[PDB]
Amino acid sequence: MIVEKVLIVDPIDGEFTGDVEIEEGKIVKVEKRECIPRGVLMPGFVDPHIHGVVGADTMNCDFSEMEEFLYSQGVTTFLATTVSTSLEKMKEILRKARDYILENPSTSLLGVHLEGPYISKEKKGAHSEKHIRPPSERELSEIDSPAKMLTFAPEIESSELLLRLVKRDIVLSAGHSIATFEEFMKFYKEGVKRITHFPNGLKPLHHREIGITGAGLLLDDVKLELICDGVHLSREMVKLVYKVKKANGIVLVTDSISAAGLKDGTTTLGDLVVKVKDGVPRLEDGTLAGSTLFFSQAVKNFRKFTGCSITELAKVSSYNSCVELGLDDRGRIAEGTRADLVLLDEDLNVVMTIKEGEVVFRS
Amino acid sequence: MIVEKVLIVDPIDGEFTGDVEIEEGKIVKVEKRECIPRGVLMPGFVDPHIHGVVGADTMNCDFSEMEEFLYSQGVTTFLATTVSTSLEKMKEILRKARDYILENPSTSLLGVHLEGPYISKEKKGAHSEKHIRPPSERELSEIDSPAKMLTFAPEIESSELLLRLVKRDIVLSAGHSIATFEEFMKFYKEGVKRITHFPNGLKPLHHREIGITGAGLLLDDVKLELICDGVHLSREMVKLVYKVKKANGIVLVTDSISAAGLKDGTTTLGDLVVKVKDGVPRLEDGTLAGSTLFFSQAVKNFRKFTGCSITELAKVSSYNSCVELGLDDRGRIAEGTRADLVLLDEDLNVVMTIKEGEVVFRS
Ligand SMILES: [Fe+3]
Ligand SMILES: [Fe+3]
C-alpha cells in the first residue's frame, strides 16, 4: 500500500526521493520528500519481444511459467512472441493466450507478438524458411486479439494488407527485411513507426540506399528495439544508437528463448536445432538464434553501455513500449496510473515486483 | 575598401546586418548597423579536397587554371589533391606547388592534399592499385610543405609512421580503408580526428563491428568530409549525418575532377579511363570516380538537404576546415582576420569574391 524513502523514477517527471501510495492497484499519491533513499523504484518493465525462458516457450503456450519467472526480472507486462509457423499453430497459440487471459485477468501477459511469417527469406535468420510466406486475405482474417504486435518485411508481397491490422489494436513493426528506404516509407507514411531488433535482420546502411536501417536512424519518431546482450550489438553500436536515437527512441527487448537460464545445452526454436555455447544460442551455421538475456540484465547492460540516467532507463525499459501499445496508465509512477512497479537495489538488482498493487515477487 | 549594408555571417558571432572595412588585405572593422540587407556576406569558401576542375588537373599541376575558376565559386582557399601515384610524380607535384606558392604569395592554393598512396586496396575506389603501397621511413622524408593534408588507411602496414607528418603542419585524415573501430582508435588517441569523403571508401556499419563509419558518427570531435552532389550520398544520408554530427562535425568538399564543368564524355584521373554520364564520372565497372560538383552547388545542396541555417552553412563551407588547418586568420568575418570573402545574393549564388582585400571575381 505504501513504498517509502525511495529513489522514485518517472520517465517524465524525473527521479527524486519520496514515497509512493498504492490503493487497490492504483497509484494514488507520489510525494517528493527529501531524505536518504532505500532503493530505486521504477515502472514495471515491459518486454514486447520474448519467445520463452527457463524451459518455457510460446510455441507450447507455457504462459503461466513465463509469467511467474518474469516477475523475478521486474517484468509486469509482456508479449509471448512466436516465430514463423503454420496458420494452424498460430490460431492455437492465439486461442490459448486468449483463454489464459480470461482465466487470469490480472496477468502480465498482454498478448501475442507474431514475429513472422510475413518476412523476407533473405533476412530470415533463425526463422524456418518453409513457413515464411506472403500475407493473404484468408490469413488476415485469423489475426486479431489477443495478437498485439506483428513483425513484417515491407517489401514482401501483399505487405499492404497488414495495415488493416492496426485498427485491431495491433502494432506493426518492420524487421527481417531487405526493403529500401522508400519501401519502408510507404509504411511510415501510414503510421508504421517501429523496427524489430535493430539492426539485426536488415540490409546495412549504404552511402546512397540507406534502407530500413537508415530510416530507423533518420526518423525521429520510429522506435528501435535493441537486444543488449553485447552480442546482437556491440557496446559501441549500442552507444551509437543511443547517441542518435536518445532514450526516447529505444525499446529494450529480451528476444530470450526457452534456453535462457539453462546450462549450455542443445534445444530448438520452432522447427530448427539451436546450439548454446556460453549463453550465446546460434544455428549450426552460426546465425544468432535469439538470446539468453534476462530482462534485468538488459537494463544493467544498457545502463553500463551508455551511462544514461535511471530516468532514461525507464523510457527504454517500459515507458516507450507502453506508448507504442497504447498503455496510457502504465510505464509511470504518477498519480492516477496503474501500480505496476519494480523495486531495485542501487546496482539495479530486482528486489521486488508489484503487479496491480500486489507484490508478486520478493528476492 | 568597404562592403556595406550586407547580411554578415560569422561562424561564431552569428548573422547580423552591417558594414565591413577592409584595409591592406585585412578586415579592420566589422560594424553592426541596422537596415535591410544588400546581399549575404560569408567567409571565403575553403575546399580541402579537389583534384581538378574545368580541364584543369592537379596531376598536370594546372594550379593557375584551378585558382582562377574557383574564385567564381567563392572559394578563397583550396588544396590541390592527388591520387595514388609514384614517389616520382609525387615529388614533382609537391615541387611545382612549392614554386607556384613562392611566385603567387597571395594565392588561394594553400598546398597539396596527398590522397593515397597509403590506402588499402580493398577500398581503392578509383585509385590505381599499382601505386598503392605501405609508407616507409624513407618515403616519409620526401613529404613536407606544401603538403598540408594526407589521407591514409589506419590498417595498412607501417601506418604508424605517418604520425610524424603531423608536426610538419600536415593534417592526417582517414579514408579508403577497411580499418576496424579499434585500429582507428589507436590513431584517434594520437590525434587523428578527420575522415576523408565519409562514408565512401569505408567498410559499412555492422552490428558488432562499427568500423570507421561507426567511429566517425560516434566520436564528437572527429570531423567528416561530405560530397553533397546527391550521388556519393543521397540527400537522406546527408540529412542523417547532419543530424548526428551537427554543423560542427561537417566539412564540405567537392572532390571535383577535371571533367567538372565540361560536357559529358570520357577522360582520365591518374592512369585510369573514366566515363561521365549526366555529370557522374564512373570507372568501367561503375565505381564512382570523383565528381563534377561545383563548390557553389555544394553549399546550396547541403542547405537544401539539411535545412540548416546560414550561420551553420558558414561552418561547413569554411570555418571547420580553417580550424582543422590552423588558418587562425581565416573563415571569419571579424576585425583582425584576413579579408577572404564571398558575397552571394539571397538565392546563394556567388556575385563576388575577395582574396586578401582584392576583388577577384564579379558575376
Ligand atoms: Fe527475429
Ligand atoms: Fe577518394
Side-chain angles (χ1 to χ4, degrees):
Chain A
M1 194 136 273
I2 180 154
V3 184
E4 58 173 38
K5 305 178 300 67
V6 284
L7 204 190
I8 303 161
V9 187
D10 185 72
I12 292 174
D13 297 322
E15 45 199 279
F16 52 79
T17 62
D19 306 344
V20 177
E21 216 169 67
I22 308 180
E23 186 165 57
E24 205 177 62
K26 184 178 161 303
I27 296 164
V28 286
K29 208 230 299 168
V30 185
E31 181 181 309
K32 177 192 169 181
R33 188 227 283 179
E34 291 195 60
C35 59
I36 37 189
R38 186 228 297 212
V40 185
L41 193 76
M42 311 180 66
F45 298 151
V46 179
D47 196 346
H49 196 165
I50 170 176
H51 306 280
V53 60
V54 288
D57 326 68
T58 291
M59 292 320 266
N60 297 292
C61 307
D62 309 297
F63 308 127
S64 188
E65 289 77 12
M66 294 178 71
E67 173 169 358
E68 190 36 49
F69 180 69
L70 292 190
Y71 284 135
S72 70
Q73 292 303 307
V75 176
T76 53
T77 300
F78 80 103
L79 246 36
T81 316
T82 59
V83 288
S84 291
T85 197
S86 52
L87 219 194
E88 234 296 75
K89 285 303 308 305
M90 233 153 268
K91 298 219 307 158
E92 183 231 352
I93 289 162
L94 288 176
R95 186 173 58 241
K96 290 188 183 195
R98 183 206 61 197
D99 295 339
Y100 182 84
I101 293 181
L102 183 303
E103 280 148 46
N104 305 278
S106 77
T107 181
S108 50
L109 173 77
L110 209 228
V112 169
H113 173 176
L114 300 169
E115 201 203 307
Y118 316 116
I119 56 182
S120 162
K121 290 161 179 194
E122 198 181 310
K123 282 297 178 182
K124 68 187 181 72
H127 275 275
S128 201
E129 192 163 320
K130 54 172 175 290
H131 298 301
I132 305 191
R133 56 186 181 279
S136 74
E137 199 78 39
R138 173 184 312 177
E139 287 179 71
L140 193 76
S141 83
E142 297 300 319
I143 303 175
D144 199 346
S145 202
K148 291 297 171 185
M149 186 171 283
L150 177 318
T151 294
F152 78 106
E155 78 278 18
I156 205 175
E157 185 202 320
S158 291
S159 66
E160 343 87 39
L161 303 190
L162 304 177
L163 294 167
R164 285 165 54 197
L165 299 181
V166 178
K167 68 195 175 188
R168 309 179 195 186
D169 204 13
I170 300 182
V171 173
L172 290 187
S173 199
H176 294 289
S177 147
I178 50 191
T180 59
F181 174 79
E182 294 300 344
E183 291 172 312
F184 167 84
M185 286 294 283
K186 236 143 291 171
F187 285 82
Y188 174 76
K189 300 167 178 306
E190 297 302 324
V192 179
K193 300 172 173 183
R194 189 186 189 287
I195 293 181
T196 298
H197 53 39
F198 177 98
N200 318 104
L202 302 149
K203 186 93 75 187
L205 177 89
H206 292 307
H207 77 96
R208 202 168 182 198
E209 176 50 71
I210 65 172
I212 290 209
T213 309
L217 300 166
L218 179 63
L219 307 169
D220 285 41
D221 56 359
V222 161
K223 307 196 182 313
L224 315 180
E225 77 181 21
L226 310 185
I227 297 162
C228 294
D229 57 3
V231 186
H232 285 73
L233 294 74
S234 62
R235 108 121 62 191
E236 300 69 47
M237 238 312 202
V238 175
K239 216 165 302 178
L240 177 49
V241 175
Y242 168 58
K243 180 186 184 67
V244 183
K245 303 296 307 186
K246 302 309 171 192
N248 322 48
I250 285 158
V251 156
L252 250 33
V253 130
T254 224
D255 191 46
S256 171
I257 60 182
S258 57
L262 303 186
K263 14 51 200 58
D264 287 301
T266 302
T267 55
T268 68
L269 232 204
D271 297 327
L272 292 176
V273 172
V274 193
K275 302 279 190 54
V276 179
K277 299 278 74 70
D278 274 299
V280 184
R282 35 222 323 169
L283 297 191
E284 303 135 62
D285 92 306
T287 307
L288 287 171
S291 84
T292 61
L293 182 62
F294 283 165
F295 200 91
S296 189
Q297 194 55 58
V299 176
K300 291 198 203 74
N301 284 342
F302 188 87
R303 182 203 206 186
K304 179 199 318 125
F305 293 167
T306 76
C308 70
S309 68
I310 305 198
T311 286
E312 289 163 294
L313 268 181
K315 298 182 170 191
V316 305
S317 65
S318 80
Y319 184 65
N320 293 340
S321 305
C322 283
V323 167
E324 299 194 305
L325 291 162
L327 303 186
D328 309 328
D329 292 350
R330 234 69 66 64
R332 298 289 302 291
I333 296 188
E335 281 165 33
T337 68
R338 307 288 268 295
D340 287 349
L341 310 153
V342 56
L343 189 74
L344 316 88
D345 64 31
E346 60 169 281
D347 282 302
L348 263 30
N349 283 312
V350 180
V351 5
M352 181 168 112
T353 304
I354 299 164
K355 216 305 178 217
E356 274 298 291
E358 301 294 309
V359 185
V360 287
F361 176 80
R362 300 159 174 287
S363 52
Chain B
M1 319 191 131
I2 307 171
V3 38
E4 69 206 317
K5 282 196 157 58
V6 277
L7 194 262
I8 298 165
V9 183
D10 181 74
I12 286 171
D13 297 320
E15 43 159 319
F16 49 83
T17 287
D19 290 1
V20 185
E21 287 175 47
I22 301 153
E23 184 181 69
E24 191 70 355
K26 190 164 152 298
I27 289 168
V28 290
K29 198 215 294 183
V30 179
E31 57 182 15
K32 175 165 179 285
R33 177 152 77 53
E34 298 281 310
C35 66
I36 60 91
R38 191 204 132 178
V40 182
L41 188 71
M42 298 180 83
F45 297 149
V46 176
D47 191 341
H49 187 157
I50 172 167
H51 303 271
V53 62
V54 292
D57 195 329
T58 289
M59 296 303 293
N60 270 52
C61 297
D62 300 312
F63 304 134
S64 184
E65 295 81 355
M66 293 185 70
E67 174 167 1
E68 192 48 27
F69 179 75
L70 296 188
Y71 284 147
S72 71
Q73 293 306 301
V75 177
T76 53
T77 297
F78 78 102
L79 250 23
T81 318
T82 59
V83 289
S84 301
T85 212
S86 56
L87 212 188
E88 184 200 357
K89 202 154 310 174
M90 195 186 307
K91 285 235 297 181
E92 175 192 346
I93 293 177
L94 290 185
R95 177 173 66 73
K96 293 192 184 168
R98 181 157 43 229
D99 293 341
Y100 186 86
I101 300 178
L102 283 164
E103 294 169 26
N104 310 280
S106 57
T107 178
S108 48
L109 179 79
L110 208 224
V112 173
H113 169 179
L114 304 167
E115 200 205 352
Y118 313 130
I119 54 189
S120 79
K121 294 171 168 176
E122 340 275 359
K123 290 290 167 172
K124 58 179 168 45
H127 278 271
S128 188
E129 192 184 80
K130 301 188 185 307
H131 298 299
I132 302 180
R133 84 254 168 199
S136 80
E137 192 67 77
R138 221 180 300 134
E139 272 202 41
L140 264 54
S141 61
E142 298 292 8
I143 309 188
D144 202 345
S145 205
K148 290 309 184 195
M149 185 168 284
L150 177 316
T151 290
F152 74 98
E155 81 274 27
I156 220 196
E157 191 213 314
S158 291
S159 70
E160 321 78 33
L161 298 181
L162 299 169
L163 295 173
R164 264 170 309 179
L165 311 178
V166 175
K167 73 216 203 309
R168 301 185 207 155
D169 190 19
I170 292 170
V171 175
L172 289 181
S173 185
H176 295 288
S177 158
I178 60 173
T180 63
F181 178 84
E182 300 290 346
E183 302 178 305
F184 180 82
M185 288 296 97
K186 273 175 181 50
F187 284 80
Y188 174 71
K189 248 58 167 283
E190 289 296 307
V192 187
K193 292 152 172 193
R194 185 172 194 295
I195 296 175
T196 302
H197 59 48
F198 180 94
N200 320 108
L202 302 172
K203 174 67 60 67
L205 182 73
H206 289 139
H207 68 94
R208 205 160 188 178
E209 240 306 321
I210 66 163
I212 300 191
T213 293
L217 292 175
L218 182 60
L219 301 179
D220 284 308
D221 52 0
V222 169
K223 295 191 202 279
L224 318 173
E225 274 189 3
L226 297 203
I227 298 177
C228 305
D229 59 4
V231 180
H232 286 74
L233 287 85
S234 62
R235 71 135 66 196
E236 292 73 40
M237 180 63 186
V238 182
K239 192 165 313 204
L240 181 50
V241 177
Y242 166 65
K243 195 163 77 52
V244 165
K245 299 248 61 182
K246 317 307 182 235
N248 307 255
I250 292 164
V251 168
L252 254 37
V253 108
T254 221
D255 188 42
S256 166
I257 61 182
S258 167
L262 315 175
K263 301 94 293 175
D264 284 3
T266 301
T267 50
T268 62
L269 180 64
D271 300 308
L272 301 170
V273 183
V274 175
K275 244 81 172 182
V276 186
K277 290 187 180 180
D278 296 314
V280 178
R282 325 192 84 126
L283 295 188
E284 311 217 308
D285 46 302
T287 293
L288 286 183
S291 75
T292 66
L293 180 70
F294 282 173
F295 201 94
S296 200
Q297 270 295 158
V299 173
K300 285 185 269 195
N301 293 348
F302 187 78
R303 179 201 198 213
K304 207 218 284 68
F305 296 168
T306 66
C308 71
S309 75
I310 195 59
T311 292
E312 292 167 291
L313 246 201
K315 288 178 177 191
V316 298
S317 70
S318 176
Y319 185 68
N320 295 341
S321 279
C322 289
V323 171
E324 300 197 304
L325 291 169
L327 315 185
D328 302 318
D329 50 9
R330 274 162 275 173
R332 292 297 299 294
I333 297 195
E335 320 202 330
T337 64
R338 285 195 208 178
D340 291 350
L341 310 156
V342 199
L343 176 62
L344 312 79
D345 63 9
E346 287 83 6
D347 290 309
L348 265 31
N349 297 305
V350 174
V351 308
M352 171 172 70
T353 137
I354 295 169
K355 222 303 174 190
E356 280 288 310
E358 303 305 301
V359 171
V360 292
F361 173 82
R362 294 156 176 291
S363 54

